[PDB]
């Protein structure tokens, strides 16, 4: 009669603190290293996928990206690194990172026409095209904003307001234009000194254009600056401009209640369900440690940077 010994086969060498190579049987692992390299769904709600466009290009209506109009509700955003199209006209979007942070996890997205294009009887809304944003060989411009120029020979002062009568918050975008010299201004806006003044119940702003000589990007010696705001179910928004105005046409309706991040990757789509997602692929593991990728969205196990987390329960 003896006791023990029932280990007979297999080979699952492991290590301890004071001895570094023991042959333990029926070992086990709690390290996550196998994964399904495919993008999939998060708790039923499907993420938003932009193929070859940026967030700013999508929200402003890039003429080279017109397939994305219907976006009911999502969780996170998949945007490929170094997207090609982007802003066709050079410039910048003020507070881009705050908008990117907030725009993730929107629980209701919808498009409405707040100021129709027939609401400018005394201006021009057709000669606002540019050669840096083409469309099938003909020059074009964005689709959600309107660039206004002089109608007969003048740019009368604009005084327009909008009252929120819906039951949801809205998101509004407008902009300003920077000329090149003093000759360009007259052919577009007769007035030589211009301004914009936008005011709400919690906002105050006044701007003026900058005129100087700069370099050439995409055959344009000029820039364009954009802004955004959020107004409440009872408040109103007021505008006033003597020139260099990019008027709004469409505004969105949002509900918020959540925050998430943006995923930069280029992997294929699939049918699936999980809790967390990595840029390279998906994972549905319950073990507490992993090895794949640090950046993640959702609830995920920890990062250890190791390969050999074997614990085991074997005799001898």
């Amino acid at each position: 009669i003896c006791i023990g010994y029932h280990a007979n086969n297999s080979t699952e060498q492991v290590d301890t603190i004071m001895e570094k190579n023991v042959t333990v049987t029926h070992a086990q692992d709690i390290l996550e290293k196998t994964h399904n390299g495919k993008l999939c769904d998060l708790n039923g709600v499907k993420p938003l996928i932009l193929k070859d466009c940026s967030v700013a290009g999508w929200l402003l209506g890039n003429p080279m990206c017109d397939e994305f109009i219907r976006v009911p509700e999502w969780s996170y955003i998949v945007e490929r690194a170094n997207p090609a199209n982007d802003l066709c006209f050079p410039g910048s979007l003020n507070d881009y990172e705050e908008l990117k942070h907030m725009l993730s996890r929107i629980n209701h997205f919808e498009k409405i026409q707040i100021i129709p294009k027939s609401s400018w009887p005394n201006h021009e809304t057709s000669l606002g095209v540019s050669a840096a944003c083409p469309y099938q060989g003909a020059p074009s411009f964005f689709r959600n904003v309107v660039w206004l120029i002089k109608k007969n020979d003048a740019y009368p002062t604009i005084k327009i307001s909008y009252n929120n009568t819906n039951r949801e918050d809205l998101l509004i975008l407008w902009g300003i234009h920077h000329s090149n010299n003093a000759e360009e201004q007259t052919n577009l806006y007769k007035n030589p000194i211009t301004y914009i003044s936008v005011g709400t119940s919690t906002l105050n702003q006044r701007l003026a254009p900058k005129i100087a000589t700069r370099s050439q990007v995409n055959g344009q010696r000029g820039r364009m600056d954009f802004f955004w705001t959020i107004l409440k179910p009872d408040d109103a928004i007021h505008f006033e401009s003597n020139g260099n105005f990019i008027a709004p046409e469409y505004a969105y309706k949002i509900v918020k209640k959540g925050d998430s991040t943006i995923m930069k990757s280029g992997v294929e789509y699939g049918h699936c369900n999980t809790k967390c997602q990595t840029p390279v692929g998906a994972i549905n593991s319950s073990m507490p440690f992993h090895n794949i990728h640090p950046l993640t969205i959702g609830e995920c196990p920890k990062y250890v940077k190791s390969n050999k987390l074997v614990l085991a329960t074997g005799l001898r």
Partner: antibody, heavy 121, light 109 residues
Framework: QVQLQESGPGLVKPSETLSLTCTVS??????????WSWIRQPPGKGLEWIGY???????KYNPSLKSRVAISVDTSKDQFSLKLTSVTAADTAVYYC?????????????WGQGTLITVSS | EIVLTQSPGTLSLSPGERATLSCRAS???????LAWYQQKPGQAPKLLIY???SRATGIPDRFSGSGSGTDFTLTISRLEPEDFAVYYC??????????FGQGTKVEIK
């Protein structure tokens, strides 16, 4: 502001090609905000359209002189040239270089000076 | 092909009066895509009116114009000895067919 200048051969035999050169001073050919075009004018007749080229490589043509026309751009010696082939006896006229704005278009502002091309054997 | 025709053929006027040059169309063209020119022999046509009635820089105040829809009408106010040339209508746009007209002329009474 731009100024244009054109010069080319004054007599060309039939069934061969035809060439012209247009040189610009002031701004650059790579401006990206202009409509470099070409316009014809038969003596004793009206004007006509042949086509234009703007920034990039995009171009458009008339539905009359389409298969026998071509406009090219060279960015080294600030030039753009036109090459019309399959010449017939009814293509003798003055020739014009033209330019125009693209945002807030206001017709054709600046013009060249003109040159006569007569085809015969 | 939007064919444009100029109704008068030749107008002879003594100095002082006004001209009623008018060019119609076959398909209705907008009022933001029309222009007028002046052609003197030798040199090239220049710009007089762009839009429908807006005036081009340098043109004196005597030159005016009006019209919308399909029918337009140019009108010079007073006849000065220099005004004797040939004018062309144009339909510049993004319809990819820039069609001029056959022209008109004015000479001494």
């Amino acid at each position: 502001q731009v100024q244009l200048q054109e010069s080319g051969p004054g007599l060309v035999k039939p069934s061969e090609t035809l060439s012209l050169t247009c040189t610009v001073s002031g701004d650059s050919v790579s401006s990206g905000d202009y409509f470099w075009s070409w316009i014809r004018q038969p003596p004793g007749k009206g004007l006509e359209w042949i086509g234009y080229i703007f920034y990039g490589g995009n171009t458009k043509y008339n539905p009359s002189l389409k298969s026998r026309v071509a406009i090219s751009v060279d960015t080294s010696k600030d030039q753009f040239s036109l090459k019309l082939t399959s010449v017939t006896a009814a293509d003798t006229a003055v020739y014009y270089c033209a330019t125009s704005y693209i945002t807030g278009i206001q017709g054709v502002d600046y013009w060249g000076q003109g040159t006569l091309i007569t085809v015969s054997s | 092909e939007i064919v444009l025709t100029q109704s008068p053929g030749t107008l002879s006027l003594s100095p002082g009066e006004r001209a009623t040059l008018s060019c119609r169309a076959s398909q209705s063209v907008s009022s933001s895509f029309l222009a007028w020119y002046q052609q003197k022999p030798g040199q090239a046509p220049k710009l007089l009116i762009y839009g429908a009635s807006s005036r081009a820089t340098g043109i004196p105040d005597r030159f005016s114009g009006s019209g919308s829809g399909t029918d337009f009408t140019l009108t010079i106010s007073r006849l000065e000895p220099e005004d004797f040339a040939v004018y062309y209508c144009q339909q510049y746009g993004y319809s990819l067919t820039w069609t001029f007209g056959q022209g008109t002329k004015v000479e001494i009474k």
